[PDB]
Write a protein that binds this ligand. Sequence first.
Ligand SMILES: O=P(O)(O)C(Nc1ccc(Cc2ccccc2)cc1)P(=O)(O)O
Length: 299
Amino acid sequence: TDFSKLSKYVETLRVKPKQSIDLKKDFDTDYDHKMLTKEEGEELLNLGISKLSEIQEKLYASGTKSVLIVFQAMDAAGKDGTVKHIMTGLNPQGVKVTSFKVPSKIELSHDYLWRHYVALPATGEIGIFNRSHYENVLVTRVHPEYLLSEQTSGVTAIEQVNQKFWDKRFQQINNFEQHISENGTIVLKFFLHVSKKEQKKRFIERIELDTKNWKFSTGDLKERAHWKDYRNAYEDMLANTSTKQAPWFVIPADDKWFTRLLIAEIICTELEKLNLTFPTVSLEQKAELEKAKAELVAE
Ligand SMILES: O=P(O)(O)C(Nc1ccc(Cc2ccccc2)cc1)P(=O)(O)O
């Protein structure tokens, strides 16, 4: 069955703990051997959103768990659109998106995890980090001068930054994710993997659409010039922070409907392992219900 074929492909996207990573070679930005049509993918994606909605309702109602979903990607990979698609299927009461911008002055007076810790989901809730704590081994690794504005980083000069520094943040991040995973949080992390070619095509398409044009600010393409350093930082990150307990998935991003299908599928699969059910109505509660109803009929 197609779904079964989809389910098998999905497992190839999970980053194994003791695996090495080459994003050019070991992971696709688009997939040729798609086991379904686009119109089928849209159908299935819609079933996924409804299932996720049922899960969210059960989670809010009864569950002893929280859920944290992380999105990282290069610009124009489809990250915001994906977040938005997932989100509008869900109850706003139980879901919270946090897009972490450049740190505030206050946030810069705490360690780099603090603001992420502060924003964690409460039990019964779903938190989505659109960008995350991982920016601290990505954008700040490509742009290590940013560490000089970090009063907690202990970096007065970029020569001080080396591989041990990054290893040490990887260990911090893992410890953090392990702690929350051992205290009720399900952690799931998605890297939307767009090709340099497709990013260009999307950038040009945005530049030529007058409806979207006004959102461009000076230097929005700067990160594309550091494509290779980002690739490197992503590779090293993915090889050292995917655990069985807090896995990374590398999602091909060059076809958006498919990217969305995959993420919805993985989230459903993973949260289905919690065996969430609605509360059931005991005899005592049943009695109360029938008593309440009799009072209304008798007014
Ligand atoms: O989903 P939408 O909101 O319609 C699009 N978002 C978007 C974000 C930033 C910009 C400014 C910009 C950035 C780089 C190159 C040229 C222009 C334009 C549009 P999209 O994510 O679908 O592209």
